[PDB]
Write a protein that holds these residues in place. Structure first.
Motif, PDB file in Angstrom:
ATOM      1  N   UNK B 177      12.099 -29.856  -5.708  1.00 18.42           N
ATOM      2  CA  UNK B 177      12.843 -30.907  -5.029  1.00 18.42           C
ATOM      3  C   UNK B 177      14.327 -30.832  -5.335  1.00 18.42           C
ATOM      4  N   UNK B 178      15.189 -31.255  -4.399  1.00 19.05           N
ATOM      5  CA  UNK B 178      16.640 -31.184  -4.649  1.00 19.05           C
ATOM      6  C   UNK B 178      17.110 -31.982  -5.852  1.00 19.05           C
ATOM      7  N   UNK B 179      16.376 -33.025  -6.243  1.00 18.20           N
ATOM      8  CA  UNK B 179      16.832 -33.897  -7.321  1.00 18.20           C
ATOM      9  C   UNK B 179      16.851 -33.187  -8.664  1.00 18.20           C
ATOM     10  N   UNK B 180      15.899 -32.289  -8.901  1.00 16.82           N
ATOM     11  CA  UNK B 180      15.889 -31.572 -10.167  1.00 16.82           C
ATOM     12  C   UNK B 180      17.137 -30.715 -10.308  1.00 16.82           C
ATOM     13  N   UNK B 181      17.596 -30.126  -9.204  1.00 18.16           N
ATOM     14  CA  UNK B 181      18.847 -29.376  -9.223  1.00 18.16           C
ATOM     15  C   UNK B 181      20.006 -30.248  -9.692  1.00 18.16           C
ATOM     16  N   UNK B 182      20.170 -31.417  -9.074  1.00 17.32           N
ATOM     17  CA  UNK B 182      21.237 -32.331  -9.472  1.00 17.32           C
ATOM     18  C   UNK B 182      21.010 -32.901 -10.866  1.00 17.32           C
ATOM     19  N   UNK B 183      19.762 -33.218 -11.207  1.00 19.00           N
ATOM     20  CA  UNK B 183      19.466 -33.757 -12.531  1.00 19.00           C
ATOM     21  C   UNK B 183      19.838 -32.777 -13.637  1.00 19.00           C
ATOM     22  N   UNK B 184      19.435 -31.516 -13.493  1.00 16.56           N
ATOM     23  CA  UNK B 184      19.791 -30.505 -14.485  1.00 16.56           C
ATOM     24  C   UNK B 184      21.300 -30.310 -14.541  1.00 16.56           C
ATOM     25  N   UNK B 185      21.961 -30.356 -13.387  1.00 16.51           N
ATOM     26  CA  UNK B 185      23.420 -30.293 -13.343  1.00 16.51           C
ATOM     27  C   UNK B 185      24.040 -31.430 -14.148  1.00 16.51           C
ATOM     28  N   UNK B 186      23.565 -32.654 -13.927  1.00 14.84           N
ATOM     29  CA  UNK B 186      24.122 -33.812 -14.620  1.00 14.84           C
ATOM     30  C   UNK B 186      23.880 -33.748 -16.124  1.00 14.84           C
ATOM     31  N   UNK B 187      22.716 -33.252 -16.544  1.00 14.98           N
ATOM     32  CA  UNK B 187      22.491 -33.003 -17.966  1.00 14.98           C
ATOM     33  C   UNK B 187      23.510 -32.021 -18.532  1.00 14.98           C
ATOM     34  N   UNK B 188      23.772 -30.932 -17.811  1.00 13.79           N
ATOM     35  CA  UNK B 188      24.767 -29.960 -18.253  1.00 13.79           C
ATOM     36  C   UNK B 188      26.153 -30.582 -18.367  1.00 13.79           C
ATOM     37  N   UNK B 189      26.553 -31.360 -17.362  1.00 13.88           N
ATOM     38  CA  UNK B 189      27.860 -32.007 -17.386  1.00 13.88           C
ATOM     39  C   UNK B 189      28.018 -32.957 -18.566  1.00 13.88           C
ATOM     40  N   UNK B 228      35.210 -42.685 -26.950  1.00 13.82           N
ATOM     41  CA  UNK B 228      35.656 -41.314 -26.848  1.00 13.82           C
ATOM     42  C   UNK B 228      36.361 -41.009 -25.538  1.00 13.82           C
ATOM     43  N   UNK B 229      37.098 -39.897 -25.556  1.00 16.71           N
ATOM     44  CA  UNK B 229      37.964 -39.560 -24.437  1.00 16.71           C
ATOM     45  C   UNK B 229      37.239 -39.436 -23.108  1.00 16.71           C
ATOM     46  N   UNK B 230      36.093 -38.757 -23.100  1.00  9.35           N
ATOM     47  CA  UNK B 230      35.262 -38.625 -21.909  1.00  9.35           C
ATOM     48  C   UNK B 230      34.155 -39.666 -21.807  1.00  9.35           C
ATOM     49  N   UNK B 231      34.110 -40.639 -22.715  1.00 10.11           N
ATOM     50  CA  UNK B 231      32.989 -41.570 -22.749  1.00 10.11           C
ATOM     51  C   UNK B 231      32.918 -42.454 -21.509  1.00 10.11           C
ATOM     52  N   UNK B 232      34.037 -42.648 -20.814  1.00  6.79           N
ATOM     53  CA  UNK B 232      34.014 -43.290 -19.503  1.00  6.79           C
ATOM     54  C   UNK B 232      33.143 -42.536 -18.503  1.00  6.79           C
ATOM     55  N   UNK B 233      33.326 -41.219 -18.403  1.00  5.11           N
ATOM     56  CA  UNK B 233      32.478 -40.412 -17.528  1.00  5.11           C
ATOM     57  C   UNK B 233      31.044 -40.310 -18.038  1.00  5.11           C
ATOM     58  N   UNK B 234      30.862 -40.138 -19.347  1.00  6.75           N
ATOM     59  CA  UNK B 234      29.516 -40.049 -19.911  1.00  6.75           C
ATOM     60  C   UNK B 234      28.707 -41.303 -19.603  1.00  6.75           C
ATOM     61  N   UNK B 236      29.134 -43.327 -17.051  1.00  2.05           N
ATOM     62  CA  UNK B 236      28.823 -43.272 -15.627  1.00  2.05           C
ATOM     63  C   UNK B 236      27.716 -42.267 -15.318  1.00  2.05           C
ATOM     64  N   UNK B 237      27.692 -41.137 -16.029  1.00  2.94           N
ATOM     65  CA  UNK B 237      26.596 -40.179 -15.884  1.00  2.94           C
ATOM     66  C   UNK B 237      25.264 -40.739 -16.375  1.00  2.94           C
ATOM     67  N   UNK B 239      24.423 -43.993 -16.186  1.00  7.23           N
ATOM     68  CA  UNK B 239      24.061 -44.866 -15.073  1.00  7.23           C
ATOM     69  C   UNK B 239      23.523 -44.076 -13.885  1.00  7.23           C
ATOM     70  N   UNK B 240      24.040 -42.867 -13.669  1.00  8.46           N
ATOM     71  CA  UNK B 240      23.545 -42.002 -12.601  1.00  8.46           C
ATOM     72  C   UNK B 240      22.179 -41.404 -12.924  1.00  8.46           C
ATOM     73  N   UNK B 241      22.004 -40.896 -14.144  1.00  7.71           N
ATOM     74  CA  UNK B 241      20.724 -40.309 -14.536  1.00  7.71           C
ATOM     75  C   UNK B 241      19.608 -41.350 -14.542  1.00  7.71           C
ATOM     76  N   UNK B 242      19.889 -42.560 -15.023  1.00 13.48           N
ATOM     77  CA  UNK B 242      18.856 -43.594 -15.041  1.00 13.48           C
ATOM     78  C   UNK B 242      18.314 -43.884 -13.646  1.00 13.48           C
ATOM     79  N   UNK B 243      19.192 -43.989 -12.650  1.00 11.61           N
ATOM     80  CA  UNK B 243      18.727 -44.177 -11.279  1.00 11.61           C
ATOM     81  C   UNK B 243      17.924 -42.976 -10.796  1.00 11.61           C
TER      82      UNK B 243
END
Lengths: 48, 259, 148, 259, 259
Positions: B177-189, B228-234, B236-237, B239-243
């Motif tokens: 499924x396409x979601x696993x592609x994005x999910x693994x991407x978001x884990x990497x990010x 932390x410096x990137x903790x704003x993005x982390x 948000x990520x 919140x994205x992964x939970x959904x």
């Protein structure tokens, strides 16, 4: 194999350390950089 | 009449993947390239501050391999195609239920062998047409035609994984499924931002200002004593992964075992 | 019960061999007095130009050096010692390098100065020193350096 | 017919690791080099401010060894290949249940010996083909073919731990998942950041500003009375480790013992 | 046949430590050197502010001895090897259970004597091969071959402690786990930071600034009216110990006594 242990210190003692003076020379060099954020004016907003 | 390789029957367990291609298939086939990571970071370059070096592709691959690995547990899956040699115990209640078997790893692309043995000698090897599979759930069930338990009586060989999706916006149950592609991407990010966030300014420096001969330069960063410096993005990520993650567990569903 | 002798990184003095190596494309490492140690390289391909990198380590699969175009000066090469990057390394930063005149105490309680002709190492990583006129190899603590 | 070393049967307990190679395998083989730690800290370099000395690999290896120890406790696991000489008691109900045995250290790569003894003299030694194993759970069970308890009746010898992963993005049950590698790395980084956070500017300095002869500078560090300079990195490492560790516990599962 | 010193049987209670070496073994053998403490404080020097003196190694040893002592209670253990002379009462229910005995201090490296006496005269001294031990738990049980309670009937002599670990990333149950090394270190650092935190600036001075002839110097430290100078690190060390300590109690487990 063997466990990794800190062991003993190795730094010797030094006494009467003199300062470093940058040496004058006519030869060329390269200026060691730092890559980071840059600050600039919003010249468009200045026009406004 | 019908034509097929003996292990594979078009009805029940149709062939999906050639055994040899298992080795060939890799992360690049599924779109998990470093460029994908960069694309989501469009406009951001991860670079050492004291020298012009950018981090190489190898690090991205190393991270991506751990991103796909983390996902493979977080939803109990086997995601890349791989061949499995599985021994399972004899439980009477499931055995009388058409020889129900729940594979340890899912999905099942296909089944090669299904045999019953006593001491390594195959007592009975079933016809190919008899056995049938449920790919997504991995249920293996047998439909014969014309103490209460024992250990490791039966032997099962099967291929666990998902094929790269052939067509857009669609996937078969045996298909990634396409979601696993994005999910693994978001884990990497999440990892890449953890690295990059230290390289914004200096080292642990929140606020600065230089005043030289009436010149003045002043910066205040996202870095702070409690954030932390990137903790704003982390954040948000997360919140994205939970959904994303919760919505995908509904596709696989809860696990169950009788007792 | 030891390790064989370790070669020192020979500085290169002749400019001609430096330029020949550079034309061959072999990496060079330049010890600038004011602003530290840098690598120097000739660009591959048709667009020939000199490049600099401060990615100051041996190239590795996990650590790839980044090269910036720079107008390296002849005088810089001449006045600054230059080494082949294949040799210059952290492996042996010996306190008393080869050909260095050092002061050593002899058995007759008479301090003598001798030039180190050969240096080797052992299992513990010690620095055994060979001095001209003597066969026994001295240790780090026994020796001393005289400067100016 | 079949060919095999007598202790090892391809069915049930196939051989995985040569005994001699156990000593050869080291942390470096599993990717726990200091280089990996440095890679995760790409662009951050740690030095003794009083000298030019960065910390050597000795500290990193030392930290990594205690990190892999800590993870080994965080799940009740054996995490490097290691031979075990185990004496286990006779409990009747499990003994009647095909001589079920739950090894102390799991996974079990392979079983060499399984004997029943009375006073150090082997009363009865089982055939190799009889006994069978469950690698991940470590269950050892026996399938014979053609008071209520006593102490230390049986003698068990086996090899516990995990082999390094052979193929990308995949692992056998007897094989190390990449996250334990990453988890140990993250436990290591916790120590490193607990070190590096102190050295950014002097010690105990939160805010500073200095003005001399018309040039002025002001710096505000992440250090604070309530939180240390690296606290943001540590707290993000915890957020990842908790997710990483909770998910991995689902791969091994809860522990049960009868009573 | 078998060869062994009479008290020690290879089956059950194999010899591990020579009695004479008990005295020789010390803190240095287990890596608890002052250098270890310094290594974790890499880049920090603990020095008097008003004179150039650093604190000596003796203080570190004194602290380390109290760190290992605190750990020895915090998990109910005997950690350094020592010889014990133990008298125990006769309880019928345990006695009929193969003479079960729970040693007051654990682990048990080995057992030298196990005798039953009435008034100081040994009524019955059991054969060496009969008795068997559980090292980690310290259970002592007897397996004979071919009022309801009384006080101090039996006499037990045994060696309590853990040997230094022989090989990396691994330990036998009778062997010191790596976590205790780090745990005792972290306990010691809690003391050292409590000392050092007062030596950051002055004495109890939070904020300062000097302005002399247009020169200006200004500092604001971690010290505050409600937080101590090193309390940032101390808090982080508590968060570290809580993860470590809880995870290690799972290795030893809960205590139980019948009633």
């Amino acid at each position: 194999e063997k466990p990794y242990m800190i062991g003993a210190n190795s730094n010797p003692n030094v006494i009467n350390k003199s300062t470093t003076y940058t040496t004058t020379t006519q030869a060329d060099e390269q200026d060691k950089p730092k890559y980071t954020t840059r600050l600039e004016f919003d010249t468009i907003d200045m026009i406004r | 009449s019908l034509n097929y390789e003996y292990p594979y029957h078009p009805s029940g367990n149709p062939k999906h993947i050639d055994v040899s291609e298992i080795d060939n298939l890799t992360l690049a086939d599924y779109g998990w390239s470093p460029d994908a990571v960069k694309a989501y970071m469009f406009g951001i370059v991860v670079q050492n501050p004291d020298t012009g070096q950018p981090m190489g592709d190898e690090f991205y691959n190393h991270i991506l391999e751990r991103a796909v690995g983390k996902a493979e547990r977080a939803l109990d899956i086997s995601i890349l195609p791989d061949t499995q040699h599985e021994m399972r115990d004899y439980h009477e209640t499931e055995f009388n239920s058409y020889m129900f078997v729940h594979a340890y790893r899912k999905p099942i692309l296909q089944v090669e062998n299904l045999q019953l043995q006593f001491n390594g000698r195959p007592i009975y090897k079933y016809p190919a047409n008899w056995w049938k599979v449920e790919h997504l759930a991995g249920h293996v069930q047998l439909f014969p035609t014309a103490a209460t338990f024992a250990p490791q009586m039966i032997r099962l060989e099967y291929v666990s994984g998902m094929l790269p999706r052939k067509k857009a916006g669609r996937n078969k149950p045996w298909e990634m499924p396409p979601e696993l592609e994005q999910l693994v991407i978001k884990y990497a990010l999440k990892e890449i931002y953890q690295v990059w966030g230290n390289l914004i300014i200096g080292a642990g420096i929140a606020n600065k200002t230089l005043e030289v001969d009436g010149i003045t330069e002043t910066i205040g960063t996202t870095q702070s004593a409690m954030y932390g410096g990137a903790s704003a993005q982390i954040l948000q990520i997360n919140e994205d992964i939970k959904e994303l993650l919760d919505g995908l567990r509904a596709y696989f569903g809860y696990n169950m075992i009788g007792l | 019960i030891s390790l064989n002798p370790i070669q020192d990184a020979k500085p290169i003095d002749d400019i001609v061999d430096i330029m020949t190596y550079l034309k061959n494309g072999k990496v060079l490492r330049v010890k600038q007095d004011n602003q530290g140690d840098i690598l120097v390289r000739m660009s591959p391909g048709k667009h020939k130009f000199t490049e600099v990198s401060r990615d100051l380590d041996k190239e590795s699969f996990y650590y790839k050096r980044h090269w910036v175009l720079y107008n390296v000066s002849v005088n810089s090469l001449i006045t600054f010692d230059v080494y082949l990057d294949e040799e210059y390394s952290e492996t042996t930063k010996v306190k008393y390098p080869k050909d260095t005149i050092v002061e050593y105490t002899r058995e007759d309680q008479e301090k003598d100065v001798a030039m180190i002709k050969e240096i080797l190492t052992d299992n513990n990583g010690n620095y055994f020193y060979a001095l001209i006129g003597e066969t026994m190899l001295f240790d780090e603590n026994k020796l001393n350096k005289v400067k100016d």
